[PDB]
Amino acid sequence: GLHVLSCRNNPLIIPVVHDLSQPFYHSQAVRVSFSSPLVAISGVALRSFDNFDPVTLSSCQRGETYSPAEQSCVHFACEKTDCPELAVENASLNCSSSDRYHGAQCTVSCRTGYVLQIRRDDELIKSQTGPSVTVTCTEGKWNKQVACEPVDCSIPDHHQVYAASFSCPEGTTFGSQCSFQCRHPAQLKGNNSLLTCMEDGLWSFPEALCELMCLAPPPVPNADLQTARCRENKHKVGSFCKY
Amino acid sequence: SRALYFSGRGEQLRLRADLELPRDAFTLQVWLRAEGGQRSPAVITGLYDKCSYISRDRGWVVGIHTISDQDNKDPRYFFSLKTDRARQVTTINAHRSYLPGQWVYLAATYDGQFMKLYVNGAQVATSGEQVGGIFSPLTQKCKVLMLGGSALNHNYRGYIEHFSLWKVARTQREILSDMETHGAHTALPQLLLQENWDNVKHAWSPMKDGSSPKVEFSNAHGFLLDTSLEPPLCGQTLCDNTEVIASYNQLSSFRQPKVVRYRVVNLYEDDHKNPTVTREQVDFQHHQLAEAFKQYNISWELDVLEVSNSSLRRRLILANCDISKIGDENCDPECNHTLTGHDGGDCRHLRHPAFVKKQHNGVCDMDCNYERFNFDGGECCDPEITNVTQTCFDPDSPHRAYLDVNELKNILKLDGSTHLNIFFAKSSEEELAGVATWPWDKEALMHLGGIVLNPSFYGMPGHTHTMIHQIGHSLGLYHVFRGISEIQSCSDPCMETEPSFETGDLCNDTNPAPKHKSCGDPGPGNDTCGFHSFFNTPYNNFMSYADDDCTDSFTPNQVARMHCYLDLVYQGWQPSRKPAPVALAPQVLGHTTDSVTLEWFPPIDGHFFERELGSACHLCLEGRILVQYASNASSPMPCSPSGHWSPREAEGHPDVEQPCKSSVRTWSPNSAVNPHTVPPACPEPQGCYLELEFLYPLVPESLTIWVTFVSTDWDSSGAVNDIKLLAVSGKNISLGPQNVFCDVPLTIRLWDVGEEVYGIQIYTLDEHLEIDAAMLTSTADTPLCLQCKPLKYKVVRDPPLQMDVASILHLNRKFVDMDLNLGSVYQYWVITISGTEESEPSPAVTYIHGSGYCGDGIIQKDQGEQCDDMNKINGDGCSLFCRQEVSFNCIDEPSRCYFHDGDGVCEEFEQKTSIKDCGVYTPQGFLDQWASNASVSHQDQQCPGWVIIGQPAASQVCRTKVIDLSEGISQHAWYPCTISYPYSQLAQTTFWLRAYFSQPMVAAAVIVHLVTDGTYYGDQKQETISVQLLDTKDQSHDLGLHVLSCRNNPLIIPVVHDLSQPFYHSQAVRVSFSSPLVAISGVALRSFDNFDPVTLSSCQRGETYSPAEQSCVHFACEKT
Amino acid sequence: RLSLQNTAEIQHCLVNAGDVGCGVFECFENNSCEIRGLHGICMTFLHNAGKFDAQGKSFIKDALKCKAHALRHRFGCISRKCPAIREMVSQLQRECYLKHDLCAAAQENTRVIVEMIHFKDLLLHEPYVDLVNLLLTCGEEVKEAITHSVQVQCEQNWGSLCSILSFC
Ligand SMILES: [Ca+2]
Ligand SMILES: [Ca+2]
Ligand SMILES: [Ca+2]
Ligand SMILES: [Ca+2]
Ligand SMILES: [Ca+2]
Ligand SMILES: [Ca+2]
Ligand SMILES: [Ca+2]
Ligand SMILES: [Zn+2]
Structure with a gap:
């Protein structure tokens, strides 16, 4: 762009x-353009x-x-020479060659419920x-270090089971089971309240439900209940009682 | 069979509980024909958890909606799924904007972990975000399947057929088998349902108040050998097809000396004096044309038409000078002229206020004869005050000194259907001698088309091939320099880097060139893009802008193009009444042991019946139906009684090159006013209305309106108040407001209208809407088509027919050859017989009995076959002639083909194309680091910030204009759910999130995964976020404030x-904003x-x- | 000479802004035609309608409604030229004032209108010009008070210029 000249700032x-x-962009030349015939420049550095x-670093x-x-970035002959025994936790190692010489390849694969951190x-x-x-033992060095980390299904919220409170004594990591308790007036209906966490990052199917029923309505003062079924305490959300 | 017609007003149905609903896998498959202009988002069928009070999104929904919800532009098929175990909804859409009025087979397969959406039997969508069973059996009673549209009135308009559903995710082989059955009814263990629509109520129930749709008969599950040969990207007509142009290139019989009757129109005075062009000019130009086109088998029958009017010969016939222009305070060089008053004063600036005294004198004054002085208030245009031939510069007086060519054409009412009418004007422009109608244009066959020329160059030696260039324009020939100079920009998909049939000039024998006036090879710097030079440019070609002396030839591709355009567009121009031949070679459907089925194409013009004059059957179609375009148009003038009016743009066929934009070739409420005048707002809800009339009243079956633009603001009433059908009975049939799409034309079925109908009245309340054209289709066997005789055919073979068969005529375009021999080779062709007259025989087809052919489900690479789907329909991934369609790679016999892009798998040629499947590929990336730790300003158990850690679930989709942030959003993204919502304090709490990463490092860019953009539904403000980069030294490098949008998400x-x-190695990214509605699920x-x-600095x-x-680290090896 | 984008935005404002309030006349400001003070008109007279009596409040509300409604409706096929716009604005102003009895209401509150009127305001905007022109035609005492006020502020801001322009 445009810059103002001054003898004080020279050079x-x-x-x-x-x-x-x-x-x-590798500068082969510097172009300086001006409208002043009195400008004399003796060198550009x-x-x-x-x-x-x-x-060239980009490629x-x-x-x-x-x-x-x-x-600048150029092909090289030496470097990358370090191949000890390739040990990766919670992973399967399909080694192309058992020997750890220069050029040995081993595919590290994370198992069920594992994230590959490089x-x-x-x-x-x-x-x-x-x-x-x-x-790959490229010239005898594992070009990457790899590991497998576990997975979690996060805490179960009310969307998992409505009208329930969720307790996770062992957390949400892979293999955990969180128990939902039916906050009153909800009641447990089913077989199991321990929702299991899989490798998918998502919890198991609800083996039980937390049903929310209104109890038997209090007798309205100076009024008699006309709905016979309403004497029970089992009245789902939206149940009607005529007085 | 039978089909169900839904009007889209709520004719919905619920699946009866007598049938179970699958929980893990299923496959929906239905034939359908979707009318345009659906209420977006539009549902056709869906499973809903009717007991899930808060999360109704659980379940699956199929239908059509618009991609890029804002200012809806992309109506495509879609399927959305949310299993009860899954925390949110995933969805996928079709690969292309759906084509209305077409019978398509749609399928959707879910195996519990892979969700797939396939159109026309071809794979276009796959995903795997949703996993596991859809729902537990416990909620089985809660699930209800309901069809025709969601309970939110997201109805569907059109036809549905063969509702079929499996309880397993069928394979592509299985779905293609079901498609080729096309309605076979039988019970299978995996088939949950197979509806024939015979007894719908047996398994389905209507909505409340008896909202029941209509039941009809399925016209056709599928139609083989799709004749909708759509022209290429630069192609506009069937003449642009490669197959037909090659056939015309090979057939010299098709190119027998083309006698074309061309008419030159000349104007004299009242006493037949002062011709526009002398007869010597006409003869010399005709001779130049003859010398130019005898070598191309073209001869010109020169007809001369004369018109005598002294009141018009004196005046000036301006070219490219609009009457609405002039006096617009802006200089117009094409309108700058002394007879125009130097663009009415715009192109002539002077010290005007010294001539105010000249006003009110009652006598024309040159200084007053300008826009500033109202052209002396019309005194110069008053014939009594002074002569109007040299003073009337005001563009209002009917006695103006000048007119335009279009008004002259309106006066003339010529027979353009039988001759190329030639007109003359003043060629103010220097690059051309005039503007001519294209063959694909509306006015080519109408009395408005023609070629305008300057008499100063007509019949002049040295300037004679410019008229040839104008005729080349009129014959559909593109500029040989197109693709370089005529491009909109360097990204125009018509890049003609090399001579080709689909780029630029669409000719493989015309070298690339720029807009070069001289007849030499252009030098360096002549390239508009500047990327490449030019070699062997066809300056000798008549088409180039080279000087007329050097332009001396036409390339053979141009010759074939002219032949095809004469044969199709200009059927009425040529003499004689020879019937039109079949454009393309007949195709071999399939061969039995001794019988093979042969079908061919209709005539190129499409007229299946006799070409008798007067009777409307000259536009009748197959099935004895008729289809017509908008004949006449009118509308009321604003602030004026009656109005009359006649907008030619709103008439005829749709002509706009690109919808979803305000184009001048359309009627508008704004376009009915004086440009130099405030446009009155269209009135209150009576309906600002445009009425149309048709050439032939008829009992209609369907109607279509080619809308081009619409107001994006209000509701979904389509900006159209009502549609008022005009039958011959005089009754005004109201249709109510409809729904619009900026590209797809509105289509309406007209079953209830059993009366003769002549017109229509579109009522809109819009002040920006545009209407391009209209079209109507008649019912089957309408009486206007019964009286006339349909054309027949005769099939001739080499060797000839063994039995002495006269081909027993062909009215169904069908034949079966009893005479067959295994291994014997036969050549087939057909001749179109229009009664007794004989047409050009079709190109022959060479077939070997009992041999592999294109379309047998087996690839025959020797025939050049790239795919053999055993299907003769384009759009399924395999073209009509065994070539894989664009962006559809596939294998296997028959070729089960898929949309390779966007499915989820990346390959070698997708690296440079599919960023969705492969990511960006420049050398500045792109293995993105994702968050490992996340601290937020408002952290809570309900809305945790650690959801930002890592890549969030891609099934999360940004919701634009959120009413409020529910707890479902908090389960994947962080938003300040802890803070309350005080409207006096919500704009000050700068909610921020700090996404930390496992190892600090710089990034090329920042990925922000927005679940909610933060924009409120009632607010047009887009929330701003202050992105800062936190590095190892924890310096808050504030990148700055940026505007959020769900469209740009991620x-x-x-x-x-x-x-x-x-x-600076960025450990964390801090995003700060003043919007409580912003929810971000992850920063990368x-x-x-x-x-x-x-570290390179050390x-x-x-x-x-x-x-x-x-990073820079000490090393052991190297330097040896 | 009014810009087409200006025309579009003004009609959008008019179809958006309601009859009541300054919204109709707010967008009308900053136009290419330089007719200013409409927002000032609404703002100042809605300040001072409280000082106006009950009949004054009724008249001022009726006049504001008439101005907004009529100026919205009649803003139709008028030519692009600003002089026509100014002419029709003045016509609508005078029509609303005469149909809502500006004269007697001004007579009941001569002092108040004297308070609002300023020499700079009449020097700058043609609307207030139309108002004061009608005011001098609304009662001998009212026109006398208006003349006294206009002389007072005109000589305050002009000195001898006002006297030399007011010859006799
Ligand atoms: Ca002009
Ligand atoms: Ca004059
Ligand atoms: Ca070419
Ligand atoms: Ca048009
Ligand atoms: Ca084949
Ligand atoms: Ca096919
Ligand atoms: Ca892909
Ligand atoms: Zn041209």
């Missing part, structure tokens, strides 16, 4: 501002970064490196959607 | 910082792929930097 140092989401350049894959000082050498935990990922 | 917010500064860091200046030789892991 003028202008910072660079652009969208950091987009990669940079690129004041570069230390070691960062997202231009990098495992097996190739990025030179810090020169700031921990690599730095601060990027990317939980891949695919339960199975093949970690 | 909202993608780009992230920008300063280059002079490094990144769209992580940068392989770059991070944070690197030295001997230590490396992990690209993807985006």
Whole structure:
């Protein structure tokens, strides 16, 4: 853009501002345009970064490196050499080759009710959607570290069972069973109040219901109940009694 | 069989409890024909938990609604499901906007974990969000199945047939088998129900007050060999089909020397003097045309028509100069002229107020003859005050110095149906000599079409191929430079980077070019987009804007296009009465041991009956029905009695290129006023009305209105007050308000109207609505079609028929060949006989008996087959000629084909296309990090914030304009349920959420999963959120304030910082807002792929930097 | 010369704003035709209707209703030119005033109307011009009081200019 010249600020140092989401652009030249015939410029200097350049960094894959000082991403021969025994908890390891030499592949697959958390050498935990990922001993290093985490079905709310209070002594983690108690006047009707949590992140079918009935209506003063069935305490929501 | 017609007013039915309802798996399958303009959202059938007082959304619903609910534009089929175990509703919609008036087979399969919606037997939707059984048997009595529309009056308008339902999720093979049965009735263990509609009340019950629909007979479950050969994206007529254009390219018999009767109209004075064009010009131009088109088997019978009117010869026939223009305070170069008063003063600025004294003098003054001085108040336009041929610049006087070509055409009332009428005007524009009607235009066969030209260039040596270019316009030839210069923008789907039949000029032999006036190859920088240069541009082609001397040829594709357009559009123009041949080759349906069934296409013009003059049968159709377009239009003038009026836009066929937009080719309540005048508001609910009349009164069966635009604000009354049918009896049949869709035309069945009907009266209260055109279809065997004789056919074979058969005529377009021999090869063709006259024989088809053919359920790649669905219907994923349709990959024999995009599976060619299935693919991502910890401003057990942790359930769908946030929303998303709702304090509590992540890192963008956008139904304000990025040093990098919307959900917010500064590893994202109605179920860091200046700012030789892991760490190997 | 988008937004306001209140005349302000003070008219006279007597309140409510209703209904096929707009606005103002007896109500509250009228207000807007023109035709005592007031503020804000313009 347009910048104001001054001998006091000479040599003028202008910072660079652009969208950091987009990669940079390797400046081959600097164009300075002006409407002043009296402007004389004796040199233009690129004041570069230390070691960062997202231009070629944007396109990098495992097996190739990025030179810090020169700031570009190029294929490399060495590096990635660390393959001990691949042990992943709560996971199945389908190893392409039993030996842990350079190029050995092993597909780690999370089991039922498990989330695949991928921990690599730095601060990027990317939980891949695919339960199975093949970690390769690329030149003798497992390119990714993997683990399987359990799952939970969250707490059951009133939508699960109406007119009930839910107690979860063991929580909601995979395998838990939460008990719903029918808050009065609701009553338990069924076989079991322990709703089970599966791997789906969602609770089991309601083996019992919490029925809410109004009790026998109090006798209206100076009035007699005309509905014979209403002497009972079993009156579902919306039951009518004529007085 | 039988079918059920629903009027959409509540003719709903409940399934009787005598039949059980499936709990885990089922498959619904129904034939249907959906009328347009349904009340969005519209339901056709649904299961509801009638005892679930708070959550009625539990269950399943099928129907049609609009994608992008706001300003409804995309009416498509949909199915929605919510199992009782599931906490919310998932839903899916059709792949394309549904085509009304078509018999389609719709199915929906649920196996307990996979929800699938398939149209026409082809897979278009799959999902797996809802899992497990739909409901426990305990609530079985609560579930009720109710059809025809939801209890919310989300009814359906149209026809339903063969209501079938299995208790299992059938496979694509199974559903296609059921489709090819098309109404077979038999009991199966998995089939819950199979309704023939014979006794509906046996298994169904009506609504209250006897809201019962109508029962009729199914006309046809399916129709083979779909004749609706829709033209391509740039195609507008059947002439644009590749198959017919190839057939015309191969058949020189189809291109026998094309005698075309073209008429040139000339104007003289009263005493037959002062011709518009001299006879020498006419003869020279005719000779140039002949030299140009003998090599293309085209000859021109030159007819000359003369009109004598001295009162018109003196005046000026402006071209491209609208009467409504001029005096609009803006310079119009196409209207800038001395006889127009320099655009009536707009193109002539001067010190006007010095000539105020010249006003009121009663004598024309040039300075007063401008818009500012009201053109002297009409004194210059007064014939008594002064001559009107050079002074009347006011565009109101009937004695104006100038007129337009359209008004002259209205005066003339010529016979355009038999001749290409040629008119003359002043070609003010320099790029062309005039504007000509397209063959696909309304006026091409009407007395309004023609070619306007400048006499200064007509018959002039050196300028003679520009009229050829105008004729090329009139013959449907696109500009050879189209696709580069005529594009709307560089993203126009008609990119002609290479010469092709569907891009730009639609000719494979015309090289790409820009809008180049000279006849040389354009140099660098001539590209409008600038991407590519131009090679071997057809400047020698007559069509290009090259100079008329250099333009000296037409490419063979253009020749075939002209042949086809003459054969279809210009049937009445050519001499003689030879019947129209069949456009495309007949197709082999199927062969038995000794018999094979053959069908073919109707005539290209579509006239199945004799072409007798006067009688309406020249527009009669098959089944002895008639279909017509809007003949005449009128409406009352605002603030004026009566009104008369005659909007030609509202007449004829629909002509708008793109609906859901205000287009000038439509009638409007606004378009009936003076532009330089305040438009009066249409009156109170009597109905601002436009009336239409038809050329032939007739007993109708259905009506259709091509609406192009509608007000988006009020209710669902479609902005239409009422429809008033006009029968010959004089009765005004009221139809009430209807429902509109911005693209799909409104369709109405007219069963109750058994009387002769001549017109219609559309009543609307809208002040922005537009109506393009109208159309009417007659009942079966209407008396207007009985008296006339339908065309017949004769099938001729190589070798000829063994039995001496005269083809016994063909009125059903059907034949069966008894004479067959295994392995023998036969060539087939047909000739259309219109009584005694003989048409061009159809292209031959080579068939081998007992051999694989396109459509036998087995692919024959030697025939070029890409898919063999054993079906001859397009739109099922396999085209008519064994080529896989766009975006529909499939395998197996027969090819069970699916909409590959959006189903849920990603493949190699979906990486660059299906962001829905594969995500974004630029090198700045895109494996998104999801929240691991979530702290919120208002955390509660009812509405926890830790639901933001991780990716929320995709079954959650953003609800626009929420009345209130129920507890169901809180189970997946966090909103401030703890705080009360004081309207004097709800705008100050800045509710915020801090989504922390497992490992801090920068992100390319931010994904915000909005369950509720926070917008209130009664408020037009969209809530604003202050997004800030919290990094490892916990600095609150406030990205800023952004506007929420359910349409953009999941909202993608780009992230920008300063280059002079490094990144910052974002541990958490804080979203702050003043809206209590905002509920967010999760925030995702769209992580940068392989770059991070944070730790890169400290690197030295001997230590490396992990690209993807985006940090600089000491290393052991390398540097050797 | 009124902009088409301005016409659309004014008709939207009119079909949206009700007969009562400043809503009808609020949108009419800031128009291309520069006829201003309508929002000021409504605002000030609804301030001061309380100072008006009961008949004054009845007249002012009736006049506001007449202005809103008539100006909404008759805003039909008038030409785009502002002078016609000003002419019809003045005609509607005078019609409502005469049909609702502006003159006698002004006579009962001459002092109040003297209080509202300001020299700047009449110098700026043509509506108040029409009001004061009719006021000078609503009673000898009323016109005399209006003349005294207008002279007072005109000389206050003009000094010798007011005297030299008012020759005799
Ligand atoms: Ca103009
Ligand atoms: Ca004059
Ligand atoms: Ca081409
Ligand atoms: Ca039209
Ligand atoms: Ca085949
Ligand atoms: Ca097919
Ligand atoms: Ca896909
Ligand atoms: Zn052209």
